[PDB]
Amino acid sequence: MDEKYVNSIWDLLKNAIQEIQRKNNSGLSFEELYRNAYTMVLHKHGEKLYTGLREVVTEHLINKVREDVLNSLNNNFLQTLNQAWNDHQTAMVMIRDILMYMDRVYVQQNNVENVYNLGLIIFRDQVVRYGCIRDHLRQTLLDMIARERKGEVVDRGAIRNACQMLMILGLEGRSVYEEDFEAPFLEMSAEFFQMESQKFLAENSAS
Amino acid sequence: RQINTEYAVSLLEQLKLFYEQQLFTDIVLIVEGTEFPCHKMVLATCSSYFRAMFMSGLSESKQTHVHLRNVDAATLQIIITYAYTGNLAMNDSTVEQLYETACFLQVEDVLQRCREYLIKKINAENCVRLLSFADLFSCEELKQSAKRMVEHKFTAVYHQDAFMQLSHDLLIDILSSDNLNVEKEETVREAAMLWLEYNTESRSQYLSSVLSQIRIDALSEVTQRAWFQGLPPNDKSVVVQGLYKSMPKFFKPRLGMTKEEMMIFIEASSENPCSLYSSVCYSPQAEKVYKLCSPPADLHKVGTVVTPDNDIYIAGGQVPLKQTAFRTVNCFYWFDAQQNTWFPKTPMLFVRIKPSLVCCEGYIYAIGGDSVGGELNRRTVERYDTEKDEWTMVSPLPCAWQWSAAVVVHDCIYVMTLNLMYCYFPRSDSWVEMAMRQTSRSFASAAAFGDKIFYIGGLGSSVTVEIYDVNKNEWKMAANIPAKRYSDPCVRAVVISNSLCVFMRETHLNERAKYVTYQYDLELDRWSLRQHISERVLWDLGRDFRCTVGKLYPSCLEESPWKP
């Protein structure tokens, strides 16, 4: 039909997606937001919908989570990061559902990544691989793992949650998880074990 | 192990019972005022939309009255009953809205089922409609099947009313393709012209693109002033544009103008001893032997037919059952003139051995050929519908004949046997007695040239020729073919180049088979040497091989590599 109809449909769909991202999904009529997706992808306007989805997702990320992480980089940094990841995932549940109905035709025709993969990629680009969040996360994880190796006990389930989060963020395998976590960890463990062996060779014997 | 069939079906029927008898039915679908009480589990197990709708966290996870819009009542009902029992009633009309609602609800099973049904239903009178439908909803496999079938049927009819209402991209993909089947390059030109003149200013912007896909051999000639007549007034951005744009787009000949009259053979002697038989073809103009695809599952003892629309079909035959071993099957197939493959079609009702396939009034008539029933009506003659893709019985042959031939003259079926002949009237569905031959000969072939039947050979065979006239209703002798004595000639009557020629392979004592064709002079009653087939290109074919008149493309086919 006319451009005004599809523009209004996209506007109401964007409003509904933003309301869902505000954890106000509870009272939202799936039917009255999907009756707008079928009729959107039907008219061969999937490119505009995909571009608008990407823009809305990256804007919401940069506005909410990029500010929340930088605001709480010292007061439960990893806990707030895991909470933001869980919120993003639980919203990208219904988001990916709708836009997977969309994704069937779109990615089988346009040969692009799905909307779940799109959200994972934009999250990796805007939160984890940020110019400041990446180094801060690296430094704090190295510090806490070194303090754990020193002898005192710290939280351990949170590290497993973070490693699983990074593994899922890889989205293809163990490509990014390696560069972001393994490589820095390897250098620190190398220096630590070298110093430990140098201390042990002089303070004890082969017994 | 697998799944207990007992419970599998017990659960299925119990689920269906909970549906029809309103019981544990929780969510109810509200469609145009029609109630649809059902469950969430069954809907989630099939429709991806319903799976996404319930498993979410939206109000529909705790809702009951969803107002599903932009759907149909009967389509939703059949989808729900299929989700509850596995039964899909696919008629020939509601498959369109069925595919629509399936793509809306994203149900993969019914989508694949209706896609297969439409891949079977694709024919002439709905090719453009199915292509527009596969362009609306992304159905790339169906889109390609449409396009092809379309292409060909489009360039054979170009009179479809739905052709006018087509998207610009689809028209560009159709016209610019190298698979169009046209004996000339001017019919696509006038087709594009009429599609453009269907409107005016709504096609002006597409005028600059549609001419960019047709060759320049007609973009400098006529049908440029006819566009200037229909040109918008004072518009000086199209006239001079088409004036100084008729220079590149290097004119290249298409593929549709490569249909030469060829002699298609089947069940030829296989070159490699690993296979039983093969199919080859002779080129009366190119003087070569191009190979053809093997019959479907080495289908032996079959019959051929070439409709006036130049289409090859195969009916009847027997397949070696899984030493002598052969079982007869009633499978039917259609030959793709471009893809070089045999597409399966609706099989017959009864199995046949060497059936006489004859085309008439758009129907394919397989007259007799070892009927299985062998009851009091030991004929079971059948006609095939090329429009509805189904078989229909016709009036049975009055007498049971074996090793017979049949032709079509004057919109009637003429089946010939040892000495008797009966003409079938398709308008009245009856059989009328015809003239009687004075010689008892069998195992021969006949070619319909004009309004005369030429029963050549008969019994090896011989050089006896009995010409029959339809307007005169009499069998008369003309002459005998001059052949080498003490030989067994294998005669094959066929029509080619608007003349009655004969494909007669002869074999001498202690000598190999020699191939040579003769041109029978109709007014002089004499077989003249038209061309001598050199043995350097054509090897032995056998005895049970058939020959037919048809057109093929030398480009899509490949030359058979074999030593002289």
Phi, psi of B207 (to 5 degrees): -60, -40
Q: Tell me how far apart the alpha carbons of residues B430 and A141 are, in angstroms, rounded to a whole number.
A: 94
Cα–Cα distance, B563 to B548 (Å, whole number): 25
- Nearest residue of chain B to residue A105 (CA atoms): B138
Identify the experimental approach.
cryo-EM
Which residue reads 């059936």 in tokens?
B355
- The residue whose two tokens read 């092809």 is B148
CA atoms within 13 A on the CB side of B238: 21
Residue that is written with structure tokens 């320049």 in the block: B216
Which residue intervals of chain A are DSSP H helices? 3-19, 31-34, 38-42, 46-71, 77-109, 115-123, 133-150, 157-170, 176-177, 183-203
Sheet holding B28-31, edge to edge: B34-37, B28-31, B65-66
φ, ψ of residue B440 to 5 degrees: the values are -95, 100
Sign of CA dihedral B280, B282, B287, B290: negative
Cα-based distances in Å from B554 to B283, B324, B549: 9, 37, 15
- B220 touching chain A per CB within 8 A: no
Nearest to B516 by CA among B535, B500, B495: B535
Q: By CB neighbour count within 10 A (0-12 exposed, 13-18 middle, 19+ buried), where does B57 fall?
A: middle
Q: How far apart are CA A83 and CA A88, in angstroms?
A: 9
C-alpha B151/C-alpha B179 separation (Å) is 7
Which chain B residues have a beta carbon less than 8 Å from that of A34?
Answer: 49, 52-53
B112 touching chain A per CB within 8 A: no
Distance, in angstroms, between B260 CA and closest chain A CA? Answer: 39
Residue B52 with chain A: CB contacts under 8 Å: 30, 34, 94, 97-98, 100-101
Tell me the domains of chain B and their CATH numbers. 5-136 (3.30.710.10), 260-559 (2.120.10.80)
By CA distance, what is A40's nearest residue in B?
A: B104
Distance from CA of A17 to the nearest CA of B (A): 11
Resolution (A): 6.4
With an 8 Å Cβ cutoff, is A101 touching chain B?
A: yes
- How many Å apart are CA A163 and CA A175, to the nearest integer? 13
Say which residues have a Cβ less than 8 Å from residue A135's Cβ, sequence separation at least 6.
none
Q: Are B446 and B405 in contact (CB under 8 A)?
A: yes
C-beta neighbour count of B372 within 10 angstroms: 13
In whole angstroms, give the CA distance from residue B384 to residue B332.
10
How many Å apart are CA B515 and CA B287, to the nearest integer?
12
CA–CA min distance B56, chain A (Å): 5
Inter-chain touch A94–B69, beta carbons under 8 Å: no
| Cross-chain residue pair A94–B53, CB shorter than 8 Å | no
Closest CA to B328 of B347, B300, B308: B300
CA dihedral A129, A132, A134, A137 (to 10 degrees): -150
Burial (CB count <10 Å: 0-12, 13-18, 19+), residue B145 = buried
Quick check: A35 and B66 CB within 8 A? no
A39: contact with B, CB 8 A cutoff: yes
Residues in chain B closer than 8 A to A35 (CB atoms): 69-70
Option in A28, A30, A38 nearest B104 (CB): A38
B521 - beta bridge partners? B526
Chain A CB within 8 Å of residue B57 CB = yes
**Cβ–Cβ contact A6 with B under 8 A:** no
